[PDB]
């Protein structure tokens, strides 16, 4: 499913995403938009080190989930994979609040440093009633 805009940053809302862990429902929209374009089908191979980026949120085969064909890898959300290709996002979400609660918090995707740090965000959830 690619959602649009404020369709999205009502679901993300809903699912308890406003300031989970001090991140604002504006910072997870400029993540995804940046990351997926809202896209929950999106998926990135990295053949540099074989794993897979999975969903909405581009949630890493390493560590996070389990496609069972990333070498030496953990499954943090302890999650297969394909949860993360739902149209429905609340695994996503779940694995995504999973992620911020270690040490590095929304910093975990470089994206976020690249696009959303120190940005002006507040376009992202502008007119969406949240």
């Known amino acids: 499913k690619v959602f649009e ?10 699912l308890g995403m406003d300031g989970y862990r001090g991140i604002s429902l504006a910072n997870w929209m400029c993540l995804a938009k940046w ?7 999106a998926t990135n191979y990295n053949a540099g080190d074989r794993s897979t980026d999975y969903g909405i949120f581009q949630i890493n085969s390493r560590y996070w989930c389990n496609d069972g064909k990333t070498p030496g890898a953990v499954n943090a959300c302890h999650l297969s994979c394909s949860a993360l290709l739902q149209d ?22 470089v994206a976020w440093r690249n696009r959303c740090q120190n940005r002006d965000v507040r376009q992202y959830v502008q007119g969406c009633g949240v």
């Open 5 to 14: 805009r404020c369709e999205l940053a009502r679901t993300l809302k809903r």
């Open 35 to 41: 990351l997926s374009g809202y896209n929950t089908r």
């Open 88 to 109: 429905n996002i609340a695994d996503a979400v779940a694995c995504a609040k999973r992620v911020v609660r270690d040490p590095q918090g929304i910093r975990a995707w």
